[model samples]
Target: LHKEPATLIKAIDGDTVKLMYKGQPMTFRLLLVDTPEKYGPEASAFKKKMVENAKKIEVEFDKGQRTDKYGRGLAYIYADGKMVNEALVRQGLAKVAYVYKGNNTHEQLLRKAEAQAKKEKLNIWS
Candidate 1:
């Protein structure tokens, strides 16, 4: 999992974001997570805050398919020094999802976070 630096352009909900990568704006669908519309506004706000407060943002491509049918890059997003993807799950704002054939690099982490969230009855879990 190598991280490639990128500039934040927009935080689209919890699982989608736009970034300036290699001088071009690209959309990324955060890997292995999904946020529901019921908590979408709050999730987007959380992501925005995370991106705004970070001194650096980066994207890590998974070993599976790099892009979805929509052409959005499938990746793990990092803000500052933390993984925003896992953070969202840990906060109960997102859930472990789309665990496709080859995109399981961080599946364990997401699942663990989901378990913790469920145990604490946080947000979506509640």
Candidate 2:
């Protein structure tokens, strides 16, 4: 588990969240995932649902780069019993969107989830 303890503050969008890392406020963009922002109520619903379900939020940083271009933390979030980032793609709320610079640790798992979601044509994939 290549991770850290970041207090999840809120979800900005389905794939973006605010967190308090190492005692400072920061925004985190989920690695290897993308979600639609083209709808209002629908978009808000996706974000809110994840926030509400997350009783415990933990961030696992990517090995190669810890931050993105703007320096936002790049991570895989664990919410409740599920890895929320991966779950979003698996459920079709999001899609595999990044090829992290040097981190290939869990890339295959994410691709498989996205592939299954695409095959099922669930939610956003539909």
Candidate 3:
């Protein structure tokens, strides 16, 4: 399964992160969801919290079928028995992002979690 050990260095946003795997910097686009952009002065604190949560857990990737247009590895990550992307949604940190051609096994669960989070106003979006 090509398992590898890596450390999450920085979370670029809700759905992306800068990681160091085997001493090389790589970008990971979390499969199944997208969070708000964390690039401007108006960025939400929830984005920062996502990163913090990421750092608290060991990141594991389930390499998926295809990479994105940018060539980054598309993966579903797991941390503490929870799907990382869905966890973000459950906490109201990100939104479900549909990649029509790239949808994977966890897509349905991701959508359900995001809807629940939205209904409950879980994150800064509330």
On TM-score, the leading prediction is 1
Model 2 Cα displacement at 110 (Å)? 1.1
lDDT of 1: 0.90
Q: Candidate 3: deviation at residue 32, Å?
A: 1.0
| Clashing residue pairs, backbone N/CA/C < 3 A, model 1 | none
By lDDT, the best candidate is 1
What are the models' TM-scores? 0.96, 0.86, 0.69
List residue ranges in candidate 2 displaced over 4 A: 38-44
Which residue pairs does candidate 3 place in steric collision? none
What is the lDDT ranking, best to worst?
Answer: 1, 2, 3
Clashing pairs in 2: none
Better by TM-score, candidate 3 or 2? 2
lDDT of predicted model 3: 0.63
lDDT of 3 by residue, 1-126 (tens): 333556767767556667776688777777777666532322335444645665343445444555678866576655444566777778777777766463566778888888897789766457
Give the alpha-carbon lDDT of every model: 0.90, 0.76, 0.63
Q: Tell me the tens digit of each residue's lDDT in model 1 across 3-119.
A: 999999987877788999988999999899988877888888888899878899998998988999998999999998799999999999999996765989999989999999999
| Candidate 3 C-alpha RMSD relative to the actual structure | 3.7
Better of 2 and 3 by lDDT: 2
